[PDB]
């Protein structure tokens, strides 16, 4: 279980990676 | 939990579901379909060969009455046992198997297909 | 006159000769390159992502504003 | 040989990982062939551009 | 059996597997009309199809040419007002013909197992009708037209981070002008082979699986061949439809539209009361009921989830509602409610009616969220009302 | 050699597999009826997992 | 095996049927790079429908707007010019894969038995392909596209019944008019889905029987599966495609083009050089070449004819051509008049282009009335090479 | 009329290269018969004995192996092959005689081809 947790953490990470890419929302990233 | 003799709600409940069983010439147990729960499939195998085939040819004539928009002849309402039933014993063992299978670190012996 | 194919799995050996036509063999004690194979594909599926992340953006976007309206708002 | 096997057991281990190296690697390839194709085109036509006619600014 | 000779033409290979899945599909012998319907819902699709095709043979997705272009086709084409009158009360019998399949399968509960694809693919076919038939009002481009365009498109502003952004977006240019007609107009075109796809899909898991039995008990004692046994029976079906929906086209065409949608597009003035087509007024009462227009989005797709939940239920093992008195209770006051939330949705917002929305939506889910208590206590029934 | 026995546990598992079994290449030796038999890419690519 | 419980979530039902068709489907281990390009066809279609759908998105079919509108999308949307020509140079890109399909299956004779039908779907796909390309030519509203449209349509008069009637009927009046524009522009948009469908029993039927091979020769002996083994192989193909593409989009976008088509439509002025797009030329020449235009029409529907014929020939036991010499000169004969005439409808119709025309009909014509002559012959060479 | 080597020099250089090809990818003449074409080829290798129609199965998975490889078959091997050497045209003129004579006379299709 932790385990699995640690690999959805990281499936998580690597999907918001690739929806930042898609998206580019340097500008709107202020914080 | 006061359903029976003690609920006259839960007693009218069981007059209607008595006579509408009765009506088609049906049991409880035959509503439940193999496909739905796969267990009551496991049960059905485990059931005896005579006890399967009552409950076929019970089902088939249901579907027969059904289809031409009729109900048994009041001799047979008469004669009938909606609630003798017969699966719910093999149900609750293969259940309990089942709960302590997957309790300690077990493979399911049969799971549903992805449709 | 024992078949080829009786012959050959009734004695098996460790001398065992591939086509190497196409495909040289590595010498039998050297480690497989797994890794550089690896490394190819990875540059090969940049490419790919930044390909499709190319095409979805042309066609969102194109679904998007024209400067004829952004011109007329004013 | 030994580079290519670093960098495997860095960075191919799991297949998340993987994913975010392929889309970080996607992005910093593309920015950085947009830069050498524009040092290309600016080394190539020079004295073209917009910014560059010598009355940009005279027409009033 | 060798197949050395060919016998039939209907077991060759170019014929096999319309012939299984057409002709010798084994069917329970016991079914009523209602999957009569499911059927007539399939050819009002097709319908619609084919006279939409013909219909854009003469439309002009242009802002300033598409009423006229309408009337054109009303007044000048050999037959035209036949084919606008047939597409636009299609699309009524179509949404009339789908609600009586969906409630007929809450009904004989066709949701539960092993029908749960078949249940899900059909909530998807429900949203792609929903947004074809959208996108399609917003064609003639009238007073209802434009207006309940602008208000659906702009309660998309509702979400949290990119409401705004998907709004403009999708209106392209800050209203609902010539870009967002001709977009309309594309999709409109383009959705209804996706939908058949969907349904394509739907009658294939379906066939997968057999199919539901006003009895819901298993059913594969007595099964008889598609043809010619239900073929005539959908036949019976499709008859009495095309004297329902000719008596729709003929002699009252547009009682089941508003005649603000013959007043061309003005976006200065505003139609005292706007209001979507008959067959989107429940889902607008519920969220017109529910305020503050996040909830209100929020809530709907609650609707929709609260549809995907239902096949995925613990116990409920008796299956039909003959069988099943207090769901039978329970589906019919539903049903009422149903009827009631849509006729809340023509209503203005002052009272009572917003009580009364208020009212309609929370039973909706009630019925939605009290299902699975039932399905309970009905597995705990068998060993209590034993005659021994 | 019981001791040595009861001190593997499930990391000293994962990781003398991780050492032995992740993305290595298998030898294959059949014989028979094995015209179903999948063949060496599919072997060699069912040694590891991309979901984790 | 019985599938008591969950192996591969490959094989379950709900991916079993794309499990066997896709990944699972044996195909001979030795094909060559020429059936990529029947699995590149469907990649160009499917171009030209996400394409298509969003340049709808903006095009308007009126008659003082289309040209307008084209122009709209070039200067205005954003990123509308690389949809334009993707559009227009995806067209040119399936016609040409399409060709290469077709010339591979007449090298292997791939249309022999038992593939009749798969060749005969295949041709009725291919007239689908130019009706779809021929009317959607017609949408930009060019001086080229007008007229080229009005001579073909007006050239649909030469069957002796009806003849005025169907042209009438086609043109919606008495000349190409905005409803011969609006016509077009419908049915543009509805065939490329029968175009799917019709792709969709291509690869149905060719399943059935399974791909031919080099060799010509019965192989299921070594027999591997599709994926991945011919996944990557047109996976390569793929990107060499999408580099033809590029260059073809990016640095030549018009080069394939025809300049008059940037004039808008005139009906009082021709333009002195009327010719279909490339890929119509050898038909067009062909037609041109027959005179007495009847005659013309005539030709054009027995091309076809033997198109459809090609697969019912004699015994010709030996198919593939890498073990026919004669027949292997003969499809090279064939390719290099297909090409001469393809060159000679974009010439004038002046001498001598006349003769070169009128001989090279002839010899397409040759090449399928002398095939069946070299599989009688061919019938008994055994007998007559053996070594006994 | 009927052409053979010995009387056409046409002939002889058709049959030389024909015999260069099967050679290159050694099988026979007879191999290049595929039984889903006629379906009488397929009668008459149900009647041939098993040792030829294995040894033609395997000279069939030999070529496609070159084939697929890209590659011909060794210079030996090549001066060893026997193409029309041949082991069913006899067998398929007696079925085809056969299905002829029962077409002739009365008689239904012992086999048939399905649609498609
Ligand atoms: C579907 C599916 O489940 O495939 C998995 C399946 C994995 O094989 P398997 O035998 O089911 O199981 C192997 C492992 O035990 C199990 O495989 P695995 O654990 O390596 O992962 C399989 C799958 C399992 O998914 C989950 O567990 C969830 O997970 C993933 O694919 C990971 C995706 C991660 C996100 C990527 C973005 O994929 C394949 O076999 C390959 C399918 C290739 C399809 C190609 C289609 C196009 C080709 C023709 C073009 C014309
Ligand atoms: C005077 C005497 C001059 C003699 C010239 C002979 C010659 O050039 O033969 C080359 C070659 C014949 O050489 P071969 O090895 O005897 O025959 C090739 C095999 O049939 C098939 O073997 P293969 O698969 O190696 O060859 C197929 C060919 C396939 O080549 C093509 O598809 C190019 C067609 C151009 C027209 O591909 C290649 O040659 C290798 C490159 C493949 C890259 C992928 C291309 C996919 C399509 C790209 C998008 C097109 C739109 O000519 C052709 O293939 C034509
Ligand atoms: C939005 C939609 C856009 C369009 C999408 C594509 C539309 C395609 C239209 C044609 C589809 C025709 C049906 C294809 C799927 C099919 O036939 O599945 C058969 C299968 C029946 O189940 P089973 O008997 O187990 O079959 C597998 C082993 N025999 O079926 C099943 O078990 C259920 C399959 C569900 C669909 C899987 C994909
Ligand atoms: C608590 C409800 C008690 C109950 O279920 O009563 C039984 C009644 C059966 O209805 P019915 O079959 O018409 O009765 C004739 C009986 N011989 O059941 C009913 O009348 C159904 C009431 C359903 C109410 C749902 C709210
Ligand atoms: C049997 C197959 C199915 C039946 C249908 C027929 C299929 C045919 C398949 C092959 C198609 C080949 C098409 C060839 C197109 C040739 C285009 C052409 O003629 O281009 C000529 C052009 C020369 O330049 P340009 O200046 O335009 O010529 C002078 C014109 N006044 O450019 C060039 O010369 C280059
Ligand atoms: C132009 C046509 C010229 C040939 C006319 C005779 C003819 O049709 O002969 C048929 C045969 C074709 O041989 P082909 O199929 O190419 O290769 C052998 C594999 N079957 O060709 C032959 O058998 C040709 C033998 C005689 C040489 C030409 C005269
Ligand atoms: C009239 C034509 C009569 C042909 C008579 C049979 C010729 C057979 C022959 O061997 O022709 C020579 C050659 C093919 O043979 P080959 O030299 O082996 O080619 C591969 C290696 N160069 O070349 C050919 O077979 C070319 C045949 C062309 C036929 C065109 C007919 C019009
Ligand atoms: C495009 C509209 C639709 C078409 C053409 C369609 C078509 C069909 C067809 C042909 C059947 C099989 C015949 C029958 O049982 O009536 C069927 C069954 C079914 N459909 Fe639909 N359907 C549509 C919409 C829906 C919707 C919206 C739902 C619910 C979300 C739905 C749920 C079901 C269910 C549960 C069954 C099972 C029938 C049974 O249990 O006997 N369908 N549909
Ligand atoms: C691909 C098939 C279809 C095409 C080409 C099509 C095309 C059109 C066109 C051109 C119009 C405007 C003509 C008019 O104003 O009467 C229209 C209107 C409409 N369409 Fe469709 N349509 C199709 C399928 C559907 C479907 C499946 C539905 C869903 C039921 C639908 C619902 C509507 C509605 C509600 C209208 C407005 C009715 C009105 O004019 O008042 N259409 N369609
Ligand atoms: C449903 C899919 C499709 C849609 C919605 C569609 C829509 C359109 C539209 C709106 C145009 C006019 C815009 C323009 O001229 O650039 C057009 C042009 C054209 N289309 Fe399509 N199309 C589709 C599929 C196809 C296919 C499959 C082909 C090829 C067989 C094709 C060939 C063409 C050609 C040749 C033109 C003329 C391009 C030009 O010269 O400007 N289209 N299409
Ligand atoms: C929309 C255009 C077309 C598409 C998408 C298409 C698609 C395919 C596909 C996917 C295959 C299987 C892969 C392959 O063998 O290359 C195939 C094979 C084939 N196609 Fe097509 N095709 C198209 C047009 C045509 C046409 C116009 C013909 C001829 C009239 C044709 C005749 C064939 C033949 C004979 C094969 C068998 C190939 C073999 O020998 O194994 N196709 N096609």
Redesign the pocket.
Same mark, same amino acid.
Not at chain 6, 48 to 51: A, L, V
């Given at each position: 279980q932790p385990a699995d947790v640690k690999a959805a953490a990281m499936w998580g990470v690597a999907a918001a990676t690739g929806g930042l890419y898609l998206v580019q929302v340097s500008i709107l990233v202020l914080p | 939990f006061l359903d029976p003799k003690k609920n006259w709600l839960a007693a009218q409940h069981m007059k209607s579901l008595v006579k509408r069983l009765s009506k088609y010439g049906l049991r409880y147990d035959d509503l439940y379909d193999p496909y739905y729960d796969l267990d009551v499939k496991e049960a059905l195998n485990r059931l005896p060969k005579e006890v399967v085939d009552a409950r076929h040819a019970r089902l088939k004539r249901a579907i027969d009455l059904s289809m031409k928009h009729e109900y048994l002849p009041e001799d047979l309402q008469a004669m009938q046992t909606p609630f003798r039933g017969y699966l719910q014993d093999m149900l609750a063992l293969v259940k309990r198997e089942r709960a302590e299978r997957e309790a300690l670190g077990g493979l399911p012996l049969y799971q549903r297909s992805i449709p | 006159e024992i078949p080829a194919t009786v012959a050959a799995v009734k004695n098996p050996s460790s001398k065992i000769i591939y086509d190497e036509h196409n495909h040289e063999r590595f010498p039998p004690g050297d480690p497989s390159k797994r890794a550089f194979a690896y490394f190819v594909l990875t540059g090969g599926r940049f490419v790919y992502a930044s390909l499709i992340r190319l095409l979805v953006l042309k066609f969102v976007l194109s679904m998007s504003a024209s400067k004829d309206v952004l011109a007329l708002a004013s | 040989g030994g580079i290519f096997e670093s960098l495997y057991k860095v960075v191919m281990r799991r &297949?998340s990982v993987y994913?975010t190296f392929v889309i970080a690697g996607a992005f910093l390839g593309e920015r950085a062939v947009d830069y050498g194709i524009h040092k290309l085109w600016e080394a190539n036509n020079v004295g073209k551009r917009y910014e560059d006619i010598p009355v940009l600014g005279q027409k009033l | 059996t060798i197949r050395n000779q060919r016998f039939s033409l209907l077991k060759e290979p170019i014929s096999s597997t319309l012939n299984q899945h057409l002709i010798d599909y084994p069917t329970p012998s016991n079914l009523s009309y209602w999957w009569g319907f499911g059927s007539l819902a399939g050819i009002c699709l097709v319908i619609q199809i084919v006279t939409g095709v013909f219909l854009a043979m003469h439309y002009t997705p242009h802002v300033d040419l598409a009423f006229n272009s309408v009337e054109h086709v009303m007044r000048d084409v050999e037959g035209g007002w036949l084919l606008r009158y047939m597409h636009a009360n299609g699309a009524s019998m179509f949404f009339i013909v789908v609600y009586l399949h969906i409630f007929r399968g809450l009904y004989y509960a066709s949701y539960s197992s092993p029908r749960e694809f078949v249940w899900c693919l059909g909530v998807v076919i429900f949203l792609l009708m929903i947004v074809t038939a959208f996108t399609g009002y917003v064609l003639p481009w009238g007073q209802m037209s434009f207006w309940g365009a602008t208000v659906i498109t702009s309660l998309a502003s509702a979400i949290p981070v990119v409401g705004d952004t998907i709004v403009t977006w999708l209106w392209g240019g800050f209203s609902v002008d010539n870009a967002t007609l001709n977009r309309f107009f594309s999709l409109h075109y383009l959705l209804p082979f996706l939908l058949v796809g969907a349904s394509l899909l739907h009658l294939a898991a379906l066939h997968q699986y057999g199919s539901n039995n006003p009895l819901g008990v298993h059913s594969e004692m007595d099964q008889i061949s598609f043809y010619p046994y239900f073929y005539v029976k959908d036949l019976v079906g499709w008859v009495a439809f095309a004297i329902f929906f000719s008596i729709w086209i003929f002699y009252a065409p547009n009682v089941l539209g508003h005649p603000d949608n013959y007043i061309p597009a003005n976006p200065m003035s505003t139609p005292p009361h706007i209001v979507p087509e008959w067959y989107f007024l429940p889902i607008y009462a519920i969220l017109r009921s529910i305020p503050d227009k996040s909830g209100g989005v929020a809530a709907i797709a609650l609707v929709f989830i609260c549809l995907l939940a239902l096949p995925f239920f613990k116990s409920m093992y008796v299956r039909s509602s003959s069988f099943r008195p207090i769901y039978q209770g329970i589906f019919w006051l539903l049903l009422a409610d149903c009827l009631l939330l849509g006729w809340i949705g023509c209503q203005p917002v002052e009272a009572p009616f917003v009580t009364i929305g208020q009212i309609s939506s929370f039973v909706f889910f009630l019925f939605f969220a009290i299902t699975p208590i039932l399905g309970r206590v009905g597995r705990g029934i068998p060993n209590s009302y034993t005659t021994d | 050699l019981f001791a040595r026995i009861d001190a593997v546990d499930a990391s000293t598992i994962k990781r003398v597999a991780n050492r032995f079994i992740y993305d290595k290449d298998v030898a294959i030796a059949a014989m028979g009826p094995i015209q179903r038999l999948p063949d060496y890419n599919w072997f060699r690519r +069912?040694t590891?997992? &991309? +979901?984790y």
């Open positions: - | - | - | &297949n994913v | - | +069912r590891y997992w &991309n +979901r």
